[PDB]
Design a protein around this ligand. Sequence first.
Ligand code: HPA
Ligand code: HPA
Ligand code: HPA
Lengths: 292, 295, 293
Amino acid sequence: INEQRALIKSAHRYISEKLEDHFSSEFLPKALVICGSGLSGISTKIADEPKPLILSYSTIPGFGELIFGYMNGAPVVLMNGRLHSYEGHSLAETVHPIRALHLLGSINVLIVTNAAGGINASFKAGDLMCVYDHINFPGLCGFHPLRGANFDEFGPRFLATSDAYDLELRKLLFSKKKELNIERKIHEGTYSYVHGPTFESRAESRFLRLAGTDAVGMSTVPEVVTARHCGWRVLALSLITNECVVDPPASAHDENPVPIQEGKATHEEVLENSAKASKDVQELIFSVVAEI
Amino acid sequence: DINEQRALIKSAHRYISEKLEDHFSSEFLPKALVICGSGLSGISTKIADEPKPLILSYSTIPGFKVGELIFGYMNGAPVVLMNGRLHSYEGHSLAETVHPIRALHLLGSINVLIVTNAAGGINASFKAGDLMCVYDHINFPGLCGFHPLRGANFDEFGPRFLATSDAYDLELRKLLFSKKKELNIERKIHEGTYSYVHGPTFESRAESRFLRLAGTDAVGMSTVPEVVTARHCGWRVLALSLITNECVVDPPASAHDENPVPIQEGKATHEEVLENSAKASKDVQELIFSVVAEI
Amino acid sequence: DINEQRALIKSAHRYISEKLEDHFSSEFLPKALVICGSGLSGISTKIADEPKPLILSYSTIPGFGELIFGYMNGAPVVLMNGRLHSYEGHSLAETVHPIRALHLLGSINVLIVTNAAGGINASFKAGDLMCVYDHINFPGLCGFHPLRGANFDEFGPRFLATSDAYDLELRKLLFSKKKELNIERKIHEGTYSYVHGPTFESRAESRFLRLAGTDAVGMSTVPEVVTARHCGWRVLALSLITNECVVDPPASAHDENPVPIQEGKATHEEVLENSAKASKDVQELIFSVVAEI
Ligand code: HPA
Ligand code: HPA
Ligand code: HPA
């Protein structure tokens, strides 16, 4: 833990010095925006003045790029590039940026998006889901970002997660949907984090629905839990990029079977629907960030 | 590396056995191991002063990591107490966590594990302050690969494939309820299923709802690896959970609610767990003290 | 680490390939890998004497129990006799290594795999078979996943669908051969749940598995299935129901005439006894199926 602490310190030391050298007045970001699915182009919405700062991950200790600048009048930090647990990284590596950035002392809000399969039978690809709760499946079984010695200078040994998704931020999001007259459906529901990288089988999706899942994805919950451990408020927004297949597969006894490949999830589909929802998601987040 | 685990178990047992020989006048053959989790932090005081008990710090015993083992007579019965158990969420391997059970099994006399812990109430009828006699468990991490028997089998202790459908001895549970009645303890003792989850987070609302749906009556971050290991060694097991808090299961306030309930309302805290553990300690302590005397 | 796994896979394939070329006078291109789990331990005896089969002990193959290469019912196959179960402490990469090594031969397009399983579906009886047409990979959902790590781009996609994991035509082939062979043994079609083991499930765990949609539970096979699919192979999976899981709640301390909690408990002895009983049928089924893959 003591070496993790050193890495986090070194990272903060590097970042804060770049900031004070780059910005005329002290740059104190209010929000970290993990620019996942839907948010690939929101950095273009960063204001020209003051000139934004772009730090490559490669030059930051423990860390793709961080972008520092003003967005709709508000000072933010953007993460373009994230580490997914299915790539083999430890969860400490995944959430290192949150802990490093916490040391700036100004960030109080995490805004994070991701792609997700719709488990709720009412959801359609293209819909969004504002996350109000989650199930951390890997967390229940030992794959937990807080496993190990507690970072006492950050948060408590035992962290409650029944209050993870700030109600006021969710109300802010829906007020901006209405204000912008965005017609895209925004559900409110439970996000289940599963490790991946497989898409769910039919039986797995049926299990997840039975378990109370509205949408399933392969990221975000470790970052949410770590941000909550640091005391941050969290807004999480899922893009429903595909409808999960839940019907039993064709029986060998069926006269006219539905092909088992029919409607199967693909990364191509995820990418295509992420791009379609991108303008709405970026404009929603653009509006929300000003009022934080 | 089962070899190196074996070496650790053997050296720990060597150390313990030799200390017992040096300390006690007569041979000391404990019949039970009591793991003193929540509500049992004080039961070491009930160990008889005569003959003088032996205290072994985890720091002085091989393989033990930290915490102490206390060897003595409780209510006329020779026992070993474990104070200061290890937890997986702290980063220890499950091997490290259950190592004490294997080391103590080599004394050849222990045939019962008695374990206590704190648990969140998942069953809607449970209240803070209630107890739950455990009659079944769900080993969630174990199903997924975080399992105390993972690795080469300790064939000198038990079978490669261990049944767990019979983990919680019926006669010991009946004894528990007998003593409850004998002691006139008015505190409720439920009978139910304990689910082991890794922690160290308290469950989200959806997580608790999932646990409830899966058949959980109480949830905690300990005990099941020790139970499974004790069963692999062929011991009987009595497990008792302190319901320290009622898990929040209702959905959080909707952004569309005009009169939303604060999402932090009723949130679990370690402070509440400690406070309720303490309020229950007297009853839990008298209960176990009474049980050990009748095997 | 993917560097190391790739080196092992390359070295294993080279060793196997060289042995095949020396051993068989004609080029040997197996079309199926048969993982000879429960019910299949004797199927190697149905390998044709001519051409003489090649047996490769695991201890001589890099990264690897024996591999048997030969002709079965006219078809070139490789048999895995010996598998590595995760509960023994092996990584999932080591467990599925043979599939990636053998994929480099460039001819296998089908995995046939058997295993023993506990019946979770209340209608299943010991002695029944279950043709798998879906699974739940509980360990995989929670992080214990054979594709965890950098992706093997040479084999398949970063993100793999598993809603189509159990080939329909192969399942129809299996049931056709059951009919043709006049096998009266029941063959269910349902969902296999993989759990780590090595414990047999508690009553509460089985009850949980049942409500999750499990028909049969076992401690193997799903990581192999997922890996074969990642390689683009078709999969036929067949479980032997070797015991009926204990699911009823245990006796209450308040019961007057409690049912003994030990009654009906699972034992490895029972698993092996029932695997033995079903073995003739399972071998006859797989033998006839490979002729048409
Ligand atoms: O169907 C899905 N499952 C898991 N993660 C996902 N991310 C996008 N779609 C999915
Ligand atoms: O709510 C809880 N969850 C998990 N472990 C616990 N130990 C006491 N309360 C709880
Ligand atoms: O009951 C069982 N559970 C898990 N694996 C099994 N393999 C055979 N029977 C079982």
